[PDB]
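Exercise: predict the structure of this protein bound to chloride ion.
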Amino acid sequence: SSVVGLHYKIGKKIGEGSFGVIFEGTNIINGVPVAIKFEPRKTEAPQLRDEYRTYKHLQGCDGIPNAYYFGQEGLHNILVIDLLGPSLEDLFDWCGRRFSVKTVVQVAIQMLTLVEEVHRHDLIYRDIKPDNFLIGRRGATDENNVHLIDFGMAKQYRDPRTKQHIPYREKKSLSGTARYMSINTHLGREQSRRDDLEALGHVFFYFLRGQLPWQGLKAPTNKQKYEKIGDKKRTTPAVTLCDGLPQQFAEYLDSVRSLPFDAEPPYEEYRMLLLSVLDDLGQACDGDMDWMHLNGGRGWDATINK
Ligand SMILES: Fc1ccc(-c2nc3cc(F)ccn3c2-c2ccncc2)cc1
Ligand SMILES: [Cl-]
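Solution:
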């Protein structure tokens, strides 16, 4: 049968989660579209049952989609959530692999707020990348707002009732994407709130410069490539990465790298630091983003851009 979760018809396949069986769906009750997620049963890495419970925990938070169904169906686990638009990596490629200063700033402030809400619910993300940040759908009220999805790497960091941080430890397996992970993750240290914020700092320079200096290194094995990548991050100060860029981006990365392990980041102060970039350059924060000027003003297309 084509109907799963009682009320959800399976449509076309959308991927972008390894080859995880993701689809576009349609609630046969009201017609709203969804994003159906399958997971093979009796697999070596079961994580769908817990990703559901993370969406219910963050249910009601802005930028986090709602979870609507989870149950057994044949030899698969199915999770129905909201359907969202392209990723920041998708819009990045379509704008020439370079974002202007105003759009990097405006997106940065929304990404900081989404990460803070995750931290207020006793969770850290541990997989910061623009591929997991999506806008909304065309014609919707949240069409160009930034959303956060995929919490298969999210990790509890403090007790929900005592608010006591997890103890510091080392000698852990490398977890995340090598291009954006913090220096502390390269060293096999326990991740905390400060590492999500440093990963966000690497994404900002990735948008401004179009590339990062630790891209395209040669190494015979995989382990030696992550070492060589983390080495370039300790040799490059924040000032050189900020060459020809507003120095507040260098101040941000340096500050989040000086945070203690169990310290609480000054989120509002970081967002005010990134806002003053627009004041120094005579710009307003009205919400105008670069991808809003694609294709003569129509916006992003299907067959021309994808
Ligand atoms: F239940 C789920 C859980 C995760 C997804 C998902 N994963 C990725 C990975 C990606 F690189 C890009 C996009 N997405 C989605 C996604 C796509 C469209 N609209 C909502 C979410 C979907 C459904
Ligand atoms: Cl790379």
